[PDB]
Design a protein around this nucleic acid. Structure first.
Lengths: 1359, 88
RNA sequence: UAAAGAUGAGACGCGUUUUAGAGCUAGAAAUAGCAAGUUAAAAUAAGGCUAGUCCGUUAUCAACUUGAAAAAGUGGCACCGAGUCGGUGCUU
């Protein structure tokens, strides 16, 4: 007769577990109605379960395919503009020229016109291809000659220059400033010394063009350039940037001391995301460096393509490509002669066999250039007479094709130069070229801006452009039809993000001046210093902050600590020696845009006037959004009177990138109600305890949490789950959690719960990568010291997995509480002690633990240890303090006896640490569910909170499972997702009822924060209006809290509310309840059925092949003529009951088949499915019996055997193994035989548990065997693993158990997987026949599994 | 049923460059594209592709000074066929 | 300890498919020997309808009912058990 309940949830990227508990912590059970056509009408189910689903991916590959499609559309339009200029006089020269270029793809039999595209007979085609072997012979002839040429050849040259036009990276014209090698090299060393002012690379006489633009190899040019430098390493940063510019693969590991490899190469197509991955690590001020290496790279490649001086021809590129052509010809003739004369048996596999990597595999065969070089280099080394061809092969100038991958470095001003020279040579003979000249050149040079977008007309979700007139946008009326101010304002309103904290506010640019004052005061507000005579190390006072930022951050670019200790402390404030804490050897923030603009204007008074803020903020915003020269001119018109013309023209060329995450109103706009200060006023001058940004939002003393809380309101639910910040996987987790809570409220008689407990655990332990910082941390820690521990005992990041050994090196091999050394050999006999005990907070970290020889060396204090080891090992803790091994917090906790025991402020700090769910994704989740449950309004326009919503930590529930033996093995079944959610609802509600004055700190909502210092008792047996003397909030579940000195304080067996007397936890009953719910056999595990979307197949284009299993990539194309798709992907399957024709007798044999529908055919099927199937050979199709079957549709066979449909001809396992909980505790305790994390006494009792219950292994083999003979039904693999288990019955238990955990991959749910016992690799048992499913029972399931519709498929097909 | 072997991109390319109404009728009655593996595209889809292309070719010659004396003939033929379809 | 986080706009260069770049001699033929090769045109998810110098691989999605679709509806409760959920009264 209970009616109050709760809900536990836990959200994941592939799981949402859920539960419903009542007020006595019992998962209830209900008879649920079952729909369908079967003879079963109800089943009891429990209210516990888990939803399973595949991950969501990003829209990035869809983006890249989208932009490539629209580029092909626009290129084809360029060619049609040009043909429409030429078509009126081309229609007099040759009537069918555009037809023949338009049908050149076809076979000889299919064409209407003649098979030769350009001229139309074969004599003129052989003459054309003899005079002009490449297109560059034609282009060079049209540039140089004065004769009237044919109109067809002029179209072919202009079309080849317009279709392949070059990049738009260089603005304006080509000059020595932006395209010679030497000036790009000078810009690389100016940018380099801008980043490294301590080491100026002297480049006073380096002739970089004559060194990096010589016909040499890459290593030889590198070593010549490094040898011309005075005293530099080839493997330094600068040598890696020069070798990056040449086109090698440098390694950026040894420059920044990274843990992994960083191989960057510019022609490698992962340079974008690898560059972003390096800039995520080594900082983000190195993008101008790695960009100034790429500009030099294209300058080198461009001056290595054009190996032809000007003042001979007007076309450098064409003559250079004819030079490459003739070098190919003479090296090929020389190579054929040298192979016929010396190695006659290899002529067939070099010059005839194309599956190898010879010249037949290079020209005809599809190999690259590099594969050809690795092939024929040992062939050329053997032969005599191959000196010069090996000189060329070492130089990547042997047998070059003209359309290579290196052509991505030609600007469009080269093609524009040749285009204009052809149109000026050939216009005295054709007048329409003279009239239309600027129009053809507009077709080449026109380029749609970033700020205009797709030129849509109201039908795309990506476009924003507004039209000044209603005409068609061509390149010749773009600046007449497009409203560029309104399109640019729509661009700003669309591309500028919103603030997460204070929505409907725009985030500042990352190079904004206010974001830079914010990040500099945010870093300067938490830096401390200690002086002789200033023995309490305080923060900086606010006037010292203003003087430090006005003397150092406005003089240097980067500020390291030596100018703070030198220029301010030793000169201005005039001390002798002051240690500075909180900053590690260099500041990370900088006032960078202040120095950029200061270099452009050179006027300190303009930047520091501080009434000129909005001008400069609008400048940095303009240079952040736009990249167009003309719109940047258009927007900075209004500020032109504040500058000259050289400073203005120099401001236009400075582009910034990056959007920050904090708005302007969040930095200067909202105010504290008590003081009347903004967040930046707190960060400039705060007072005593200088609190930084997060300590200002998350402080209840201040109005900031109230304002940001009340402002976060935000529309529909998909806007709530679209606007928040997270990966699309976790957003799919959040949306399914909302739908799960909606249907759990529908189940419970539409009564909203008392609570909703939410916990968002993580799966992000991927590596070992933290052990590199463990090893490196002992490296720098001992190398600070000077001890003899690294020499006698070398460290490595594979031995440091032991925490007694990691703490052995961290304490320099020395005992903490006793002045003695420590043997490394006897870590089994040494004790580990928490300084602040476990009864105050659960702190297993390396910050708290100290390795000792005897655990009773800490005295007799149940509190923190004594002060003898403080006063004796003070300098030992000083040496460990300055080695960056122990922190000031650990030394303070060691000296809490020196500051006179613990205080109530300390204990309020411990509760403060234990309760607060500090992450923001869970806070948005509790905001969504709280704004969706609690909707009702009272009279005063407040909010009646019907439903509390609670967010816990993960370590609370994890320590509940560890301490009360509710162990979790993730490999046995999928029930742990459900059981974690149940334990959330148990733990959170017992805490919400035990301490009702801590509800402000983990319930979402505006609650009265209470004095946490007053809710803490001062005496032990005092307990009236107090809560606890022991600040571990999870003690009241335990019967025996354990003091550190060696006592047992026994708590009462019935915990009540300390004020109102409600019974909240009974230890004699509720552990039996929890242990009874974590062993129920029936748990509602559901796999979510998803229709497959994506690409139509594997997306490579293949040659022509006669197989009839290849669907062509177009429609009339016979796949034996061109080629097609290798394996198309199925969207969903369809069960069809229809009569097919059996054979030559034309009989209407009724079949019941399973037909996959592909992603290509899916919309054709959903248009008219009877026509679709009927055109595939299905007569007599019934509409009411077409059953959509998506992936993971669930079927039920006999004996409770289930199968999830993986594809139209494959099945997957659909069952679960409810292994009894005693075997699960046995597998966890057995396979975790060493890693137990507890005292050796009760873990010796656990050794007695596994040793006295070793026959549980045999009973588990009986469980796996009986479940396998009922539903898994792979007999060969089961006899194979029974024999494999019988071959090892004398092995140790910690690998038999560790391999039975491998044996559960036979009996899992999902795709069958190949696993490995002690010896035997077992191949997977696929269920490749969907034949049995057509007699099974189809189960449609809602998201909770509770409401289901079960369809008898054997009653379909009869009449 | 006696029509050539192309697809929709090739359909649009191959019916662009006609120079009379009778040539567009002949080169229209010779080509198709299948809209899926067993069904042929309807005549209103093919005529709408030809409307788009002679609209482009008809209108870009007006941004220039080029005399489009045809391409407004062929576009009027296409639009009258599309009107005869869509009225019914 | 908390804090980018996804999403969008513009543009190159390859690659891959067909097709054009007269193959010669010996031989009734298989086959053999020799010549030559570097480039161009077109296409680049199939396709769609609103016909744009746009859209076409993301996110969304149990079943049934009403709806063109965004959507809104449809499933008694309590005790004793538990091998994937059974039994027992109670209003129906």
């Amino acid at each position: 007769m209970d009616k109050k309940y709760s809900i536990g949830l836990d959200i994941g990227t592939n799981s949402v577990g859920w539960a419903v508990i009542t007020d006595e912590y019992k998962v209830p059970s209900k008879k649920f109605k079952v729909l369908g056509n079967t003879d079963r009408h109800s089943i009891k189910k429990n209210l516990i379960g888990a939803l399973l689903f595949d991950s969501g991916e990003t829209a990035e590959a869809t983006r890249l395919k989208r932009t490539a499609r629209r580029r092909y559309t626009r290129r084809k339009n360029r060619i049609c503009y040009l043909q429409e200029i030429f078509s009126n006089e081309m229609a007099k020269v040759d009537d069918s020229f555009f037809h023949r270029l338009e049908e050149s793809f076809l076979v000889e039999e299919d064409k209407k016109h003649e098979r030769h595209p350009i001229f139309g007979n074969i004599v003129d085609e052989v003459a054309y291809h003899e005079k002009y072997p490449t297109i560059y012979h034609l282009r060079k002839k049209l540039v140089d000659s004065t004769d009237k040429a044919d109109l067809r050849l002029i179209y072919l040259a202009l079309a080849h220059m317009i279709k392949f036009r070059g990049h738009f990276l260089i603005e304006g014209d080509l000059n020595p400033d932006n395209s010679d090698v030497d000036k790009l090299f000078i810009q690389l060393v100016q940018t380099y010394n801008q980043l490294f002012e301590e080491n100026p690379i002297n480049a006073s006489g380096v002739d970089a063009k004559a060194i990096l633009s010589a016909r040499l190899s890459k290593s030889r040019r590198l070593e010549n350039l490094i040898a011309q430098l005075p005293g530099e390493k080839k493997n330094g940063l600068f040598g890696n940037l020069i070798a990056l510019s040449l086109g090698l693969t440098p390694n950026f590991k040894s420059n920044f001391d990274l843990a992994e490899d960083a191989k960057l190469q510019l022609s490698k197509d992962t340079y974008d995301d690898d560059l972003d991955n390096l800039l995520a690590q080594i900082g983000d001020q190195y993008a101008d460096l790695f960009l100034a290496a790429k500009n030099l790279s294209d300058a080198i490649l461009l001056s290595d393509i054009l190996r032809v001086n000007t003042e001979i021809t007007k076309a450098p590129l064409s003559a250079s490509m004819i030079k490459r052509y003739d070098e190919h010809h003479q090296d090929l003739t020389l190579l054929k002669a040298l192979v016929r004369q010396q190695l006659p048996e290899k002529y067939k596999e070099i010059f005839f066999d194309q599956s190898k990597n010879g010249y037949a595999g290079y020209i005809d065969g599809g190999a690259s250039q590099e594969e050809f070089y690795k092939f024929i280099k040992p062939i050329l080394e053997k032969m005599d007479g191959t000196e010069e061809l090996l000189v060329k092969l070492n130089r990547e100038d042997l047998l070059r094709k003209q359309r290579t991958f290196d052509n991505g470095s030609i600007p469009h001003q080269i093609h524009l130069g040749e285009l204009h020279a052809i149109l000026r040579r050939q216009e005295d003979f054709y007048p329409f070229l003279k009239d239309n000249r600027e129009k053809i050149e507009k077709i080449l040079t026109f380029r749609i801006p970033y700020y205009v977008g797709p030129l849509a007309r109201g039908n795309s979700r990506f476009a924003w452009m507004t039209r000044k007139s209603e005409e068609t946008i061509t390149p010749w009326n773009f600046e007449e039809v497009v409203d560029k101010g309104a399109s640019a304002q729509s661009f700003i309103e669309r591309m500028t993000n919103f603030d997460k904290n204070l929505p409907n506010e725009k985030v500042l640019p990352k190079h904004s001046l206010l974001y830079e004052y914010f990040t500099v005061y945010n870093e300067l507000t938490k830096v401390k210093y200690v002086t002789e005579g200033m023995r309490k190390p305080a923060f900086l006072s606010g006037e010292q902050k203003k003087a430090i930022v006005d003397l150092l951050f406005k003089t240097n670019r980067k500020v390291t600590v030596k100018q703070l200790k030198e220029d301010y402390f030793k000169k201005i404030e005039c001390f002798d020696s002051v240690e500075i804490s909180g900053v590690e050897d260099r500041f990370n923030a900088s006032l960078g845009t202040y120095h950029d603009l200061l270099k452009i204007i050179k006027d300190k008074d303009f930047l520091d006037n501080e009434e000129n803020e909005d001008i400069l903020e609008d400048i940095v915003l303009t240079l952040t959004l736009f990249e167009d020269r003309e719109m940047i001119e258009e927007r900075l018109k209004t500020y032109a009177h504040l500058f000259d013309d050289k400073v203005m023209k120099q401001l236009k060329r400075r582009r910034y990138t990056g959007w920050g995450r904090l708005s302007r109103k969040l930095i200067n706009g909202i105010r504290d109600k008590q003081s009347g200060k903004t967040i930046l006023d707190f960060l400039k001058s705060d007072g005593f305890a200088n609190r930084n940004f997060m300590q200002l939002i998350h402080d209840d003393s201040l109005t900031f949490k109230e304002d940001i809380q009340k402002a976060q309101v935000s529309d529909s639910l998909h806007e709530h789950i679209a606007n928040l910040a997270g990966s699309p996987a976790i957003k799919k987790g959040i949306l399914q959690t909302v739908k799960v809570v909606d249907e759990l409220v529908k189940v419970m008689g539409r009564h909203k719960p008392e609570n909703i407990v939410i916990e968002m655990a993580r799966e992000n332990q991927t590596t070992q990568k933290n052990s590199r910082e463990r090893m490196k941390r002992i490296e720098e820690g001992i190398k600070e010291l000077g001890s003899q521990i690294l020499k006698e005992h070398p460290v490595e990041n594979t031995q440091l997995q032991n925490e007694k050994l990691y703490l052995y090196y961290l304490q320099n091999g020395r005992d903490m509480y006793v002045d003695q050394e420590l043997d490394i050999n006897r870590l089994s006999d040494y004790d580990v002690d928490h300084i602040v005990p476990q009864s105050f907070l659960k702190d297993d970290s390396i910050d708290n633990k100290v390795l000792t020889r005897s655990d009773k060396n800490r005295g007799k204090s149940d509190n923190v240890p004594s002060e003898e080891v403080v006063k004796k090992m003070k300098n030992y803790w000083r040496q460990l303090l300055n080695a960056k091994l122990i922190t000031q917090r650990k030394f303070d906790n060691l000296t809490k006896a020196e500051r006179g025991g613990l205080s109530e402020l300390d204990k309020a700090g411990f509760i403060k640490r234990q309760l607060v769910e500090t992450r923001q994704i869970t806070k948005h989740v509790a905001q969504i569910l709280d704004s969706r449950m609690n909707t009702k309004y009272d009279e005063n326009d407040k909010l009646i909170r019907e439903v509390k919503v609670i967010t816990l930590k993960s370590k609370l529930v994890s320590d509940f499972r560890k301490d009360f033996q509710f162990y979790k093995v993730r490999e046995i079944n999928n029930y742990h997702h459900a059981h974690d959610a149940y334990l959330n609802a148990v733990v959170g509600t017992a805490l919400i009822k035990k301490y009702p004055k801590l509800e402000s700190e983990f319930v979402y909502g505006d609650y009265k924060v209470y004095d946490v210092r007053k809710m803490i008792a001062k005496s032990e047996q005092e307990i009236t209006a107090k809560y606890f003397f022991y600040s571990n909030i999870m003690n009241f579940f335990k019967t025996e809290i354990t003091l550190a000195n060696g006592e047992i304080r026994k708590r009462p067996l019935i915990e009540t509310n300390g004020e109102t007397g409600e019974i909240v936890w009974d230890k004699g009953r509720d552990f039996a309840t929890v242990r009874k719910v974590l062993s129920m056999p029936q748990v509602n595990i559901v796999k979510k059925t998803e229709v497959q979307t994506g690409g139509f197949s594997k997306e490579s284009i293949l040659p022509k092949r006669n197989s009839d299993k290849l669907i062509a990539r177009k429609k009339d194309w016979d796949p034996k003529k061109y080629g097609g798709f290798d394996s198309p992907t199925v969207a969903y399957s369809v069960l069809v009951v229809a009569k097919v024709e059996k054979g030559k007798s034309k009989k209407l044999k009724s079949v019941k088949e399973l037909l996959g529908i592909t992603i290509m055919e899916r919309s054709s099927f959903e248009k008219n499915p009877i026509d679709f199937l009927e055109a595939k050979g299905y007569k007599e199709v019934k509409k009411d019996l077409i059953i959509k079957l998506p992936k993971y549709s669930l079927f039920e066979l006999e004996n409770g055997r289930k199968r999830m449909l993986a594809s139209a001809g494959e099945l997957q396992k659909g069952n679960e193994l409810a292994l009894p909980s005693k075997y699960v505790n046995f597998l966890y305790l057995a396979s975790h035989y060493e890693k137990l994390k507890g005292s050796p006494e009760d873990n010796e009792q656990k050794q007695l548990f596994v040793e006295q219950h070793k026959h549980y292994l045999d009973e588990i083999i009986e469980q796996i065997s009986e479940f396998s003979k009922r539903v898994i039904l792979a007999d060969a693999n089961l006899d194979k693993v029974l024999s494999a288990y019988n071959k090892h019955r004398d092995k140790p238990i910690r690998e038999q158990a560790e391999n039975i955990i491998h044996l559960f991959t036979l009996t899992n749910l999902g795709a069958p997987a190949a696993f490995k016992y002690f010896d035997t690799t077992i191949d997977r048992k696929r269920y490749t026949s969907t034949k049995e499913v057509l007699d099974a029972t189809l189960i449609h399931q809602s998201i909770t599994g509770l409401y289901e519709t079960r369809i008898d498929l054997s009653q379909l097909g009869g009449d | 049923d006696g029509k050539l072997v192309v697809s929709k991109a090739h359909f649009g390319n191959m019916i662009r460059n006609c120079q009379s109404v009778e040539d567009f009728k002949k080169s229209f009655e010779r080509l198709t594209y299948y809209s899926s593996e067993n069904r042929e595209s309807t005549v209103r889809q093919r005529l709408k592709i030809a409307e788009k292309e002679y609209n482009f070719k008809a209108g870009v010659k007006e941004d220039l000074e080029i005399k489009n004396t045809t391409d407004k003939e062929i576009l009027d033929y296409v639009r009258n066929e599309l009107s005869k379809i869509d009225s019914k």
